[PDB]
């Protein structure tokens, strides 16, 4: 038994969020919660939100015991890009792509 949760279109580049999910991969739920709470890394709040959503799914929808949960999988996929329009530059269009993040957290039982 395992419980999943996903957060889409997070406005943070995948690279930065990956640095965050890397800290919690394989940890117990309690440990992951603390790491997220005290980490200085940008995007920690979004991963924390997905973590709690997965915990709510495991405990309330799948009746799993909260004290047995650990982060079985946590990863970030590249989501759709946002094409930010910049002021004209030397007569030309200036468009830069800003990538969003797709975050997945899967909780399992030890
Ligand atoms: Cl997405
Ligand atoms: Cl990843
Ligand atoms: Cl990659």
Curated annotation (Swiss-Prot):
List the Gene3D superfamilies hit by this protein, alphabetically. Answer: Ribosomal protein L22/L17
Q: Which InterPro entries match?
A: Ribosomal_uL22 (IPR001063), Ribosomal_uL22_bac/chlpt-type (IPR005727), Ribosomal_uL22_bac/org-type (IPR047867), Ribosomal_uL22_CS (IPR018260), Ribosomal_uL22_sf (IPR036394)
The domain of life for this entry's organism is Bacteria
Sorted alphabetically, which CDD domains does this protein's record hold? Ribosomal_L22
- Which keywords belong to this entry? Ribonucleoprotein, Ribosomal protein, RNA-binding, rRNA-binding
| Any Gene Ontology CC annotation | cytosolic large ribosomal subunit
Q: Could you tell me one molecular function GO term of this UniProt entry?
A: rRNA binding
Q: Write out the GO biological process terms.
A: translation
> One Pfam family name from the record?
Ribosomal_L22
Give the record's subunit note. Answer: Part of the 50S ribosomal subunit.
**Which family is annotated?**
Belongs to the universal ribosomal protein uL22 family.
Q: What does this protein do?
A: This protein binds specifically to 23S rRNA; its binding is stimulated by other ribosomal proteins, e.g. L4, L17, and L20. It is important during the early stages of 50S assembly. It makes multiple contacts with different domains of the 23S rRNA in the assembled 50S subunit and ribosome.
What is the protein name for this chain? Answer: Large ribosomal subunit protein uL22
Give the organism the record lists.
Answer: Thermus thermophilus
Name of the gene encoding the protein in the UniProt record: rplV
């Amino acid at each position: 038994m395992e419980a999943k949760a996903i957060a889409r279109y997070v406005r943070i580049s995948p690279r930065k969020v990956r640095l965050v999910v890397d800290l919690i991969r394989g940890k117990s739920l309690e440990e992951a919660r603390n790491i997220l709470r005290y980490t200085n890394k940008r995007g920690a709040y979004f991963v924390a939100k997905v973590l709690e959503s997965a915990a709510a799914n495991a405990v309330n929808n799948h009746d799993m015991l909260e004290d047995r949960l650990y982060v079985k999988a946590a990863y970030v996929d590249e989501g759709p890009a946002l094409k930010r329009v910049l002021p004209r530059a030397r007569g030309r269009a200036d468009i830069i792509k800003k990538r969003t993040s797709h975050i997945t957290v899967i909780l399992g039982e030890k």
